[PDB]
Amino acid sequence: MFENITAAPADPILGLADLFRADERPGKINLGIGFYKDETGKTPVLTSVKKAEQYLLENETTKNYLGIDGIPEFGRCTQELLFGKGSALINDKRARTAQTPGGTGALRVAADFLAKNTSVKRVWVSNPSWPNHKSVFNSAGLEVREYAYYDAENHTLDFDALINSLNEAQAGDVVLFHGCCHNPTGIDPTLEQWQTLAQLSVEKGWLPLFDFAYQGFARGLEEDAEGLRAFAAMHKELIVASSYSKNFGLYNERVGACTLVAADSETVDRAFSQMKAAIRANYSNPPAHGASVVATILSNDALRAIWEQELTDMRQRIQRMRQLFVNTLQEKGANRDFSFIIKQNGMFSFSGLTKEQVLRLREEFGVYAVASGRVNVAGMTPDNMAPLCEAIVAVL
Amino acid sequence: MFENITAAPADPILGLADLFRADERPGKINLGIGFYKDETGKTPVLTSVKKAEQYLLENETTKNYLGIDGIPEFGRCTQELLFGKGSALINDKRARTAQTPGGTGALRVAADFLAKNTSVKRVWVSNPSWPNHKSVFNSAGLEVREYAYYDAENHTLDFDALINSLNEAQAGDVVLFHGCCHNPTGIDPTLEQWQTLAQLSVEKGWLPLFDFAYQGFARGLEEDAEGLRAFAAMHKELIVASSYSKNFGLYNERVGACTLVAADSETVDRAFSQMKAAIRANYSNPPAHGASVVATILSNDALRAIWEQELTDMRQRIQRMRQLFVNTLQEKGANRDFSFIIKQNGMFSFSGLTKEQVLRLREEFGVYAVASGRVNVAGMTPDNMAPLCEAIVAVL
Ligand SMILES: *Cc1c(COP(=O)(O)O)cnc(C)c1O
Ligand SMILES: *Cc1c(COP(=O)(O)O)cnc(C)c1O
Structure with a gap:
């Protein structure tokens, strides 16, 4: 009998998905995806x-x-x-x-x-x-x-x-x-x-x-x-x-x-x-x-x-966005150094943001990232780079 | 280390497949299949x-x-x-x-x-x-x-x-x-x-x-x-x-x-x-x-x-073959009664043959069945019914 079966924990990643979809703010950005996306934001x-x-x-x-x-x-x-x-x-x-x-x-x-x-x-x-x-x-x-x-x-x-x-x-x-x-x-x-x-x-x-x-x-x-x-x-x-x-x-x-x-x-x-x-x-x-x-x-x-x-x-796209990210953050001006982003490989990397910061990035700017600071580089398009880097600069 | 890992048992069904494929006798019939086959003997x-x-x-x-x-x-x-x-x-x-x-x-x-x-x-x-x-x-x-x-x-x-x-x-x-x-x-x-x-x-x-x-x-x-x-x-x-x-x-x-x-x-x-x-x-x-x-x-x-x-x-085909099987065995004449075949459902049923009989059906006639006497009705075509029923009659 399953009458006393306890519910499995809501897996964090699944959660963001539902919070993002329900995010009425039109400028929303989801960087906690786990799949590849092209410049268009699609996975063809x-x-x-x-x-x-x-x-x-x-x-x-x-x-x-x-x-x-x-x-x-x-x-x-x-x-x-x-x-x-x-x-x-x-x-x-x-x-x-x-x-x-x-x-x-x-x-x-x-x-x-x-x-x-x-x-x-x-x-x-x-x-x-x-x-x-x-x-x-x-x-x-x-x-x-x-x-x-x-x-x-x-x-x-x-x-x-x-x-x-x-x-x-x-x-x-x-x-x-x-x-x-x-x-x-x-x-x-x-x-x-x-x-x-x-x-x-x-x-x-x-x-x-x-x-x-x-x-x-x-x-x-x-x-x-x-x-x-x-x-x-x-x-x-x-x-x-x-x-x-x-x-x-x-x-x-x-x-x-x-x-x-x-x-x-x-x-x-x-x-x-x-x-x-x-x-x-x-x-x-x-x-x-x-x-x-x-x-x-x-x-x-x-x-x-x-x-x-x-x-x-x-x-190459994933490598283009890692470069764009690093220097578009520089043009936004702030004691930082996200240059380490350039030395990492693949779609993921830890932004170095605290859960404090990832939380307000989401509630205040509608920029979704994983609580660990994990960010999917493929969620970035040359179009959302500026409004993304500005949100990051504001919480730093 | 896998140096002392013992081999898994050869699964009986897999075995027949290799013995049948290697069966040079042109009149061979495989009734130990497990999948559906049309009158043509194909699974389209x-x-x-x-x-x-x-x-x-x-x-x-x-x-x-x-x-x-x-x-x-x-x-x-x-x-x-x-x-x-x-x-x-x-x-x-x-x-x-x-x-x-x-x-x-x-x-x-x-x-x-x-x-x-x-x-x-x-x-x-x-x-x-x-x-x-x-x-x-x-x-x-x-x-x-x-x-x-x-x-x-x-x-x-x-x-x-x-x-x-x-x-x-x-x-x-x-x-x-x-x-x-x-x-x-x-x-x-x-x-x-x-x-x-x-x-x-x-x-x-x-x-x-x-x-x-x-x-x-x-x-x-x-x-x-x-x-x-x-x-x-x-x-x-x-x-x-x-x-x-x-x-x-x-x-x-x-x-x-x-x-x-x-x-x-x-x-x-x-x-x-x-x-x-x-x-x-x-x-x-x-x-x-x-x-x-x-x-x-x-x-x-x-x-x-x-x-x-x-x-x-x-x-309907599977039901046609169950009928054909039962009475083509009758036309071959032998104290039997495979009429119970008609009351069973699906592609499988136990023929009632002993391992003694299933073994000689295979070695002597090239008719392949599972050692348990299991027979897949979909392995039968109106074309192989007579040469099948004759092999069965001969071992009875
Ligand atoms: C994505 C991933 C997998 C999963 O592969 P699947 O083909 O989706 O099951 C396994 N390991 C790692 C580290 C992965 O990132
Ligand atoms: C064929 C069979 C299955 C297997 O189904 P699959 O879809 O191939 O895995 C399970 N149970 C029974 C009784 C079956 O005969």
């Missing part, structure tokens, strides 16, 4: 995906079940994007890939698999990290611990506090890493720091799990993958949960993958069978549509070329 | 869904995330199909619906929700039942117990052994019911038996969970729902996991729903919030495509009319 379906879809419409002859691990080409294509077209992991057949319901579904199947087939008890999440991370791992029965990441003073990665924090993790603990475009600081380890991280991980015996949801949004498709690749060249085992929601704009089609890398082919195949058992007891097999779309774009020269151009366009 | 994408898809292609402007519970029209449309267009459950707002990744995903979210938000410890599954039932419930941490169902001698429902078995279930135990087209016996309770079941359930305090994957395949869309409706008119609470994989032929698009019915609006909303928290920690939000397709067909008169005709066509 990519031209390359629309072409891929017309194609599927013309050529699909059946809607019959996919295998537990999804469409094969899709799996192969993602392994190449993650590790490189000619990696030893691919040639030596050390990795297996399951197509899953988004990047979140990939984290939950990893979690379920880890929980029932291994002795892992804790997962180390960065502080701060994407809030749903904790909920996924806790739901599978794993304990979540946090390692230090952000440096509130300097707006940077506290690498000392980072390596110092992880010394509390024992061999066999999983350590969660954001491949690029750290949600929500936008702060990423540099290559030197990734190599230092990869080496230390091997030494202490961490099981690295990578959350790779923004490949292509920081510097490029291959550039963004070198941190993961620095760990892959050094570990016998690792798991990578990837998403295509943002880089393909396929949010609601739920397309991602869970990649298991083992010491060798024989062992990865044996572990993957248990990962497939984990999937069968959850959703059975994955949704074909969005994954089919990804597989036909990546497998076609013309379509892939158009998609890559559409991805660089999004990446 | 319905004409109504193809139209729905061209429409979505022309009119979709964004692929941005759906809410945790899915597309609203989709939810409303399923509540109407399940309980009737003017039910008190709908008018009194006692039910809430989440769009999920297939009927299997609906069972796993029900399981997760039940496991963390209530005191349910066991789930009662029929004997036999769909094998993945046990895996879903066990994965959420629930215990699975079995109540008697089939009567191997008479090829019927042992209703005595049924009511007698359930007396071992205490108030607070969940009891799983197949809405129609029981997988795999095809044997369903009659209305009188459903009312007796609904009444006894209330009395002992069972939490009924309905697995409704074949609405429309037994007698009709509304006819098939009266068993569930006999429980709904009598219970304050219940859960229904429905699938659109088979009745819409949307297998790989993963479209189903999990419907929570509570005593009143206030309580269903409070419990549903926890059901949404269960979804957020699993896959986040659901896949739009297949559900969008279902919502546009059901919401449109023309398209819905075509779909219903396509569904009755499948239902």
Whole structure:
């Protein structure tokens, strides 16, 4: 009986959405979105995906079940994007890939698999990290611990506090890493720091799990993958949960993958069978549509070329707005220095505003931001930059 | 580390698939499929869904995330199909619906929700039942117990052994019911038996969970729902996991729903919030495509009319083959009586063949059936009926 069931907490982000929609003030700006938006303030379906879809419409002859691990080409294509077209992991057949319901579904199947087939008890999440991370791992029965990441003073990665924090993790603990475009600081380890991280991980015996949801949004498709690749060249085992929601704009089609890398082919195949058992007891097999779309774009020269151009366009816009933001705030005049905004990657970053300030920005100006000061750079258009920066200057 | 991970058992059904494909004998017949096939032996994408898809292609402007519970029209449309267009459950707002990744995903979210938000410890599954039932419930941490169902001698429902078995279930135990087209016996309770079941359930305090994957395949869309409706008119609470994989032929698009019915609006909303928290920690939000397709067909008169005709066509074919099977076996002459085949519903039923017989049917004749004697009626075409019935007669 559910007569005494207690209501789940209203998730903060969902809340802002309803408060903003109900905001009668015509000059309102929503910077707590979580999705990409163009200069127009819209999240269109990519031209390359629309072409891929017309194609599927013309050529699909059946809607019959996919295998537990999804469409094969899709799996192969993602392994190449993650590790490189000619990696030893691919040639030596050390990795297996399951197509899953988004990047979140990939984290939950990893979690379920880890929980029932291994002795892992804790997962180390960065502080701060994407809030749903904790909920996924806790739901599978794993304990979540946090390692230090952000440096509130300097707006940077506290690498000392980072390596110092992880010394509390024992061999066999999983350590969660954001491949690029750290949600929500936008702060990423540099290559030197990734190599230092990869080496230390091997030494202490961490099981690295990578959350790779923004490949292509920081510097490029291959550039963004070198941190993961620095760990892959050094570990016998690792798991990578990837998403295509943002880089393909396929949010609601739920397309991602869970990649298991083992010491060798024989062992990865044996572990993957248990990962497939984990999937069968959850959703059975994955949704074909969005994954089919990804597989036909990546497998076609013309379509892939158009998609890559559409991805660089999004990446550049997000980089344009970070610059515009920093200096439009300067032209508004105030002891500040939001220049650190320029060094961060992706759509998110902490503005450095207090909850005191974020609250009045909203009530007094109708500029919506997350209580943590998180601001989505894609919510900014060259049109709303001045009226945005003026609101920020007034609360400083 | 996965170096000592033990391989998951090869799932029997997956096995036959590979043995059949590798069967060089040109007269091979596969009756252990699990999906629908037309007279041609193909599983085409319905004409109504193809139209729905061209429409979505022309009119979709964004692929941005759906809410945790899915597309609203989709939810409303399923509540109407399940309980009737003017039910008190709908008018009194006692039910809430989440769009999920297939009927299997609906069972796993029900399981997760039940496991963390209530005191349910066991789930009662029929004997036999769909094998993945046990895996879903066990994965959420629930215990699975079995109540008697089939009567191997008479090829019927042992209703005595049924009511007698359930007396071992205490108030607070969940009891799983197949809405129609029981997988795999095809044997369903009659209305009188459903009312007796609904009444006894209330009395002992069972939490009924309905697995409704074949609405429309037994007698009709509304006819098939009266068993569930006999429980709904009598219970304050219940859960229904429905699938659109088979009745819409949307297998790989993963479209189903999990419907929570509570005593009143206030309580269903409070419990549903926890059901949404269960979804957020699993896959986040659901896949739009297949559900969008279902919502546009059901919401449109023309398209819905075509779909219903396509569904009755499948239902009638499956009913044609059950007749053809029974008497083509008679024309082959043998002390038998597969007439019980005519009283069973859906694509499946137990042929009454022993594993001894199913094994030689396969090795000697290349007729593939499940070791339990389960046979998919949709694997039969008027063309393969004679060479099928002759193989069966020869092993009898
Ligand atoms: C957006 C996001 C995800 C989710 O991916 P989905 O494909 O939407 O489920 C996972 N991890 C991080 C860090 C994300 O920001
Ligand atoms: C086919 C089936 C399901 C699965 O539905 P999906 O939509 O494929 O996940 C669930 N229960 C029963 C009894 C089924 O036969």
